Amino acid sequence: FNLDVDSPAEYSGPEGSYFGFAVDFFVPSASSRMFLLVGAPKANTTQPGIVEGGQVLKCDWSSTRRCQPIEFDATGNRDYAKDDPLEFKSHQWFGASVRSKQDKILACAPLYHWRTEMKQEREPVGTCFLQDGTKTVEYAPCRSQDIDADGQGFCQGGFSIDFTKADRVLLGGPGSFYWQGQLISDQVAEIVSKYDPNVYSIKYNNQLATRTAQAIFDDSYLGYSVAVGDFNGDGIDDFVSGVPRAARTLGMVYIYDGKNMSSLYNFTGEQMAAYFGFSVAATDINGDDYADVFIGAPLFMDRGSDGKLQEVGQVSVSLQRASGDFQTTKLNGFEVFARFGSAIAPLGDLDQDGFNDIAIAAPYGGEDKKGIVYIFNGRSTGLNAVPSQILEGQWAARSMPPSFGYSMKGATDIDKNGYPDLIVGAFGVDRAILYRARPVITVNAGLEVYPSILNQDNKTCSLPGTALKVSCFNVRFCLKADGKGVLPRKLNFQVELLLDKLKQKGAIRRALFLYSRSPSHSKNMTISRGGLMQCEELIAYLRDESEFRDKLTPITIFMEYRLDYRTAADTTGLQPILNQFTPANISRQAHILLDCGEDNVCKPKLEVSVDSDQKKIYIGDDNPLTLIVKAQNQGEGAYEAELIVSIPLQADFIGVVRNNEALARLSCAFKTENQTRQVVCDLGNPMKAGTQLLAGLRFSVHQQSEMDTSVKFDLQIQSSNLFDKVSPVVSHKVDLAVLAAVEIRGVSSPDHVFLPIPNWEHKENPETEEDVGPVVQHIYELRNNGPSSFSKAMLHLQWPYKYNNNTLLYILHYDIDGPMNCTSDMEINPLRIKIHTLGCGVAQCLKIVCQVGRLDRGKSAILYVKSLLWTETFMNKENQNHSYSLKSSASFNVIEFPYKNLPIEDITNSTLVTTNVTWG
């Protein structure tokens, strides 16, 4: 929120040269000056015969706004023979990626082409140039003897680059091995010490590199983007890379170990062609010293209000825990065709609040599709999903989109203001903008009233105009401000005081300042940074006892303070800014003495009462939890009475009750500020004598820990009175309960078998599954619909195996689905076959007993019993023409719950499944 947009730094390059396609800071160790590195591919150079070789310009913050190209190559195409070039170097896009460690500058040309030295070819291998002071080596790891498209000839190495914390480069080439992608990591020392101008293919020691893989991974574009960060405990930066076409163009992000180039973690997109992985970044956005992953899907389509798909792009925010797998949220764009997640730039800690901040850019959004950049502040809880500031491009669209925001770089304090700054490159208009952060000032102010209770018959101040005594009081307004970084010493504030703010724009003011004779006053204050809460005083007098007629309405003293632009740093108008979430006004209230007794003080007797209408709160779901409160004041008036409903962690207060006239409406509010969650409700200002108020407060409990037995609710009334200002803290609890509507259902498939079976013959010793009979399937499902879950249950299947020494339903096999094991008291399928009412009573029974694990609300457990109708026993002699109803039953018993120390008391039921065989 503190980035200056009035007078930023304007940098421009030759038109048509994409000046700004890549940007970065240059902070050399051998100097105090700092520079801008602005890549400009397609720029023309003095290279003989090279058309649009590209440049990387060094622009200075010296206010001259002058950019000077860095001498990297300066040469033409080397020759493989006479009139036979080895490289081509034209339209190579040198400067498409520029990054720099402390003193070393790395720039690459991802469209550099190569002759391959074996056959006449033009393969986009790509090359880089690492410069350190005056020496310049060439780093082309993909310009190897692995030539063609199945090797590294189209690798385009240098498409994306990055440095690690210890002089190691991370280079991505999206074209290696038929566009599978490739990451190559080399020691900067190896890159410089092993450089040989007479060797086009150099082998480096300690070179880490991903290898080729199966063809199903082709056209994934690994190395499209790169970021570095630690994701194990080794302390060495690991490799992050986006694979936007992996997994059927779902997009993936690979994390490799920065030591042995072994895979660590994977991220996968949710929507095809959304280009999950176009942009990646790594920063600790939560102040927990664990690097957190940011992934960009600029073409992600979400659902609008209507429900249609709209392309807005989304950014994947993945916080890293010390245990492994991440906690990931999402963040969607705001305009269609804006490509929200196109660039993700860490900003260090922009506001110096203790948490790092990040910037995401929509290069084709905003007015006239000019480009927008959103700033997001970090918090303890992660990343604040609400943008804090929008940066809008200022330049028109001559030929192609200005693309403001297509490239960004931050986390470097180019001035000494103590706040990191930010570079944004357009490249559509060939410009680059440097936004400088303004210092943040946190100011707290106090307001006092001497005294807060006015007595009209206590005229002690003599009015200045005429010698008359009037009832008066004092108003003290203090002001203390401070902040980090480069700042002025004495700050100029403009404060405004308002007496009785409530009665305004038509009313009797009831209170004016003594000498000013006015209801308002101003003071030009000035304070120093370190502490020193300087204050000033003014006397205000109460109007005559018979001039306003309005008592019982508090006289609200109102102070508001602004800042004057007078104090700005020597940085040519870099004026500070107050803290984002801090109030620029503060209010106290004075009350006219009325009905406070002979003691001249109002002593109230506040009383809180809460009855138990709701009795049980069932674990597992959100429940309507309504508490009816009875707040009464059986004493003198209470100034600024409020009901303080301190709730538990699972409360989530919602609304107040309107449908009843027995309980009156109330103005309540939910606020968590100091170490506590609670609900505050206005009871009257002042809450007069008697005043028996009825009110209802609805809630919805999201239970906790599965081991608690109650939920806590503490209430008490509070007031600004001196004596007896509070009520006794009454508490009311409701008991957690267990309810689990468990049911068991069964079905037969088929539920009928018509005899005789077609094409059936009698094999006295069969193993076919066809010589036995048709397949009769029994499915039993145990489902736990209830809110509360259970941890252990039993299931008892009763199967009618035989009736008078011959089989009824020969069970072939039974399968399980869910947390359940089963065991049959008889050997199922003993013959090794491979792919009226007859119950487990009057017939011989085969039992299958099952042990069930934990079943939550949506989950269930299912037993599939695949049997065969033993045709031989029917239809033969005794059961010739008789209809039989084969009956199997299944009961369940819930024995344990994960809610020990709480009543459970049972769960049990049963059902049966029938398979009727008849003669047609």
């Binding site: 074209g175 176009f278 209000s305 392309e311």
Partner: protein, 687 residues
């Protein structure tokens, strides 16, 4: 209400509710002729044609009848009716209207064959040498006015896609493989849509395949140019448009062009010049799914993905992101397109979904769809499983939230792909006509800025009402009553401290207070997860005014049904209702996000015999409801012996009401359709 809490002035007396009304006087009955309801204002006085009670209308301005045949000189085929309705709404009101859409029997059809011409398509270009005239005979059975055209694509003619060296490969990219193929091209348009089907076969066999390096080919470049170059390609605005995309490989998506140095986003504009080639191929990136969806909808183009089995699952999941596009399995030699085109046209003509264009966000649209005989399906704007000649109806409701002075915008309601549309001209009346009286501000009510409104005078700093200015203590209360509409308790809303007979609502902070008794305010609404009206509705005097596509007391209930939609098409699989974008399963034992899971439900045998009985015996349930051949889209053919072919088949048996045993079989085919083989001559009792 309208009798208190809303009588401040007109232009605001109407915004209270569609019930209130204002008046002039020709007199002034003090009494209580406030902003009362008509028939309560029409109880006392002031009705010499001065009521100022505007009612909302839905007058239609043109409704041509639905045609029976889409051919010939009985012009304006008129697949939709009505075609233009004038909508006139007052603040916070709504009116309903209807719209019918018909799949006309004989509607002209033009088919543009967009073919991949990479080397693997050599066998395909051969087997379609005569599949143009072969296509004419087949389509002729469904449309008498048929047009066809051809277009081809390979990929961007630039590295790393194009074979760039040796220099002898630019004229023969098949150089290092001892054969001949013509140089590659971005997108080639050869034949514009024409009714001469032999003219199609002539242009084919004049074409030859080319060669590319990387597997993905740029066809989204061609799909885009074939859609927005309707002039070059000749789409008939009165015809059903079919764009046939035939390829056997993956596709290049947007942002892939960065590798080739192409960073200019695709504009949805035509760039095929007189040379019939996509000129911007090498300078412009591939189009995104969002841009293709936008332009396919604007040009009424049906995209048909004719892809091979090896990549069919891919383009399937692509079509889920481009709604309205159908995919079809294509044989390796393109010997299947002819049957694939017909099967695709049947799918397209089977659905009707309404889309809304240029809808002013100030008002929201509800939809109740009538697809079957008379059974209405609320919350639906589309009908599924229709056949040509059918006609479906939709009832629509439009409601405004307040009302601006937007100067009568208009919007469009139409089905996707159709040229015909319903145009709705909205018009808001948010004030009485009396506030143009030309009695500016004058005599009778304190020359001190006074005024003369519609019959009252909202004075300046102190509006006594018909008089002015108890501005600072002038009073010694002389009208201290009526400020508490019970007069047995504190005289205001307790906020305002009544003076002047006009409770001056104080405490103007943390929002704004209003109302004649200060009863109303903002920020007094309810919370759902901690946000006021769930962050989806305005707060108007303790009541939420839900934004478009939100209902319920808390404005937390969506009107969307897409998250209720299953993989079969039906919402909640016909096993449950869809309440607030989530299913509530009704069939016992069913569960899941779309009630798709029900392992304890009856087998398919119990569900398919309902079709055997009504389709092959003309009886049983599903025939009394006349739903037989709307739910029984399965292909049924009475056969004999169930010849045990197929592993994903189930044999079913049952006894009909004639005591005979019927036997049949059920077979599905790998994302293809299903067939029921009913055994002729069931088994009945012997004589």
């Amino acid at each position: 209400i309208c009798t208190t809490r809303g009588v401040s002035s007109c232009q605001q007396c109407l915004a209270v509710s569609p019930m209130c009304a204002w008046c002039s006087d020709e007199a002034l009955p003090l009494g209580s002729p406030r902003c009362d309801l008509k028939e309560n204002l029409l109880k006392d006085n002031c009705a010499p044609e001065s009521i100022e009670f505007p009612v909302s209308e839905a007058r239609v301005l043109e409704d041509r009848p639905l045609s029976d045949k889409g051919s010939g000189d009985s012009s304006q085929v008129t697949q939709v009716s009505p075609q233009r309705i004038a909508l006139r709404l007052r603040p916070d009101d709504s009116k309903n209207f209807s719209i019918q859409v018909r799949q006309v029997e004989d509607y002209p059809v033009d088919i543009y064959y967009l073919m991949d011409l990479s080397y693997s398509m050599k066998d395909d270009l051969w087997s379609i040498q005569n599949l143009g005239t072969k296509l004419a005979t087949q389509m002729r059975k469904l449309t008498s006015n048929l047009r066809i055209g051809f277009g081809a694509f390979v990929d961007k003619p630039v590295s790393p896609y194009m074979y760039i060296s040796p220099p002898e490969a630019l004229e023969n990219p098949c150089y290092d493989m001892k054969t001949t193929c013509l140089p590659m091209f971005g997108y080639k348009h050869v034949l514009t849509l024409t009714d001469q089907v032999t003219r199609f076969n002539e242009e084919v066999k004049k074409q030859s395949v080319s060669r590319n390096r990387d597997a993905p080919e740029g066809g989204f470049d061609a799909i885009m140019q074939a859609t927005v170059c309707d002039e070059k390609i000749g789409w008939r605005n009165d015809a059903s448009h079919l764009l046939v995309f035939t390829t056997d490989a993956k596709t290049h998506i947007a942002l892939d062009g960065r590798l080739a140095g192409i960073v200019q986003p695709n504009d949805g504009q035509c760039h095929v010049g007189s040379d019939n080639h996509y000129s911007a191929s090498t300078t412009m990136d591939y189009p995104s799914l969002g841009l293709m969806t936008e332009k396919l909808s604007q040009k009424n183009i049906n995209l048909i993905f004719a892809v091979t089995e090896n990549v069919v699952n891919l383009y399937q999941n692509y079509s889920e992101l481009i709604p309205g596009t159908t995919v079809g399995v294509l044989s390796m030699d393109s010997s299947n397109v002819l049957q694939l085109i017909v099967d695709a046209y049947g799918k397209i003509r089977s659905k009707v979904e309404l889309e809304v264009r240029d809808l002013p966000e100030e008002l929201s649209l509800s939809f109740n769809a009538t697809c079957l005989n008379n059974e209405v399906i609320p919350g639906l704007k589309s009908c599924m499983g229709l056949k040509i000649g059918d006609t479906v109806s939709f009832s629509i409701e439009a409601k405004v939230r307040g009302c601006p002075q937007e100067k009568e915008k208009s919007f469009t309601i139409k089905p996707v792909g159709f040229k015909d549309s319903l145009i709705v001209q909205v018009t808001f009346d948010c004030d009485c006509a009396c506030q143009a009286q030309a009695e500016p501000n004058s005599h009778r009510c304190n020359n001190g800025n006074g005024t003369f409104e519609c019959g009252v005078c909202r004075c300046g700093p102190g509006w006594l009402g018909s008089q002015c200015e108890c501005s600072e203590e002038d009073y010694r209360p002389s009208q201290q009553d009526e400020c508490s509409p019970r007069e047995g308790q504190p005289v205001c809303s307790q906020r305002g401290e009544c003076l002047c007979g006009q409770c001056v609502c104080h405490s103007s902070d943390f929002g704004k207070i209003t109302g004649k008794y200060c009863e109303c305010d903002d920020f007094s609404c309810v919370r759902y997860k901690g946000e006021m009206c769930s962050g989806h509705g305005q707060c108007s005097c303790g009541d939420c005014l839900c934004d478009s596509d939100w209902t319920g007391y808390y404005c937390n209930c969506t009107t969307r049904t897409d998250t209720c939609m299953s993989s079969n098409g039906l919402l909640c699989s016909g096993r449950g209702k869809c309440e607030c974008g989530s299913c509530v399963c009704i069939q016992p034992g069913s569960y899941g996000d779309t009630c798709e899971k029900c392992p304890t439900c009856p087998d398919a045998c119990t569900f398919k015999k309902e079709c055997v009985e009504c389709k092959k015996f003309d009886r049983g349930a599903l025939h009394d409801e006349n739903t037989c051949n709307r739910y029984c889209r399965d292909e049924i053919e009475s056969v004999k012996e169930l010849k045990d072919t197929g592993k994903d088949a189930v044999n079913c048996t049952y006894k009909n009401e004639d005591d005979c045993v019927v036997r049949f079989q059920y077979y599905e085919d790998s994302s293809g359709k299903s067939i029921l083989y009913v055994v002729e001559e069931p088994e009945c009792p012997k004589g």
